[PDB]
Design a protein around this ligand. Sequence first.
Ligand SMILES: CO[C@@H]1C[C@H](C[C@@H](C)[C@@H]2CC(=O)[C@H](C)/C=C(\C)[C@@H](O)[C@@H](OC)C(=O)[C@H](C)C[C@H](C)/C=C/C=C/C=C(\C)[C@@H](c3ccc(C)s3)C[C@@H]3CC[C@@H](C)[C@@](O)(O3)C(=O)C(=O)N3CCCC[C@H]3C(=O)O2)CC[C@H]1O
Lengths: 107, 94
Amino acid sequence: GVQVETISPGDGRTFPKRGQTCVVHYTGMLEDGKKFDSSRDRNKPFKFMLGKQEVIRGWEEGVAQMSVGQRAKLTISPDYAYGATGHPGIIPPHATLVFDVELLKLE
Amino acid sequence: VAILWHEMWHEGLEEASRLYFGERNVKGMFEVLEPLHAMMERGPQTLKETSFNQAYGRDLMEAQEWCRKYMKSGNVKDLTQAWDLYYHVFRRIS
Ligand SMILES: CO[C@@H]1C[C@H](C[C@@H](C)[C@@H]2CC(=O)[C@H](C)/C=C(\C)[C@@H](O)[C@@H](OC)C(=O)[C@H](C)C[C@H](C)/C=C/C=C/C=C(\C)[C@@H](c3ccc(C)s3)C[C@@H]3CC[C@@H](C)[C@@](O)(O3)C(=O)C(=O)N3CCCC[C@H]3C(=O)O2)CC[C@H]1O
């Protein structure tokens, strides 16, 4: 559902636990590299909580495998992203999404 | 009915975002959001409403503007500029 390739290694021991807020910096792109969003651009980290279903499944499973400090490439199948619906005017239907996500800290 | 502006908004913005992001229903989002902004228009009559207003008064007003921009342009991007601010207020409120 979600592939996870490492760009930069993390400390390999600090994995997010449920109810924790992952502070991150991401850049989401469509299969072909087309950027549709990025926190780095806004220069404001992104925070959210795991297991609360706040974010799509690809991220829920994907980020859960990342340790603090790690930066990875997440390739999410439409099943774990926006399905046949996609997101009107932003994400098309059956879109595979690619996110460049860096797990900065846990609070 | 007695409810603090803080709770009225935390709860409202959550319902609004669910209908739009979760159900793709831009319609139910405005139905929920609308009355909230209208009340603000009426002005604060208590110390807590006033301070809540001094804190997030502007942000909310701008977000409501970005929604109006959307109503006129049909650009899903103007609608998201609003949600960037609603998120912001929502975060601080929790
Ligand atoms: C209701 O179902 C859930 C909906 C959710 C929807 C996608 C779009 C999420 C959106 C979010 O990350 C935000 C934080 C959360 C929600 C909207 C909901 O979970 C909501 O439900 C109770 C909730 O808890 C929040 C806290 C309520 C609060 C009042 C509203 C916050 C709104 C925030 C909006 C933000 C950050 C948007 C802006 C970013 C830049 C701007 C400018 S606007 C994000 C946008 C929306 C559109 C998409 C293409 C994208 O570009 O991100 C994006 O890159 C994306 O796909 N994201 C956001 C980054 C993390 C991964 C993914 C995602 O899961 O987003 C997916 C999972 C479902 O379980």
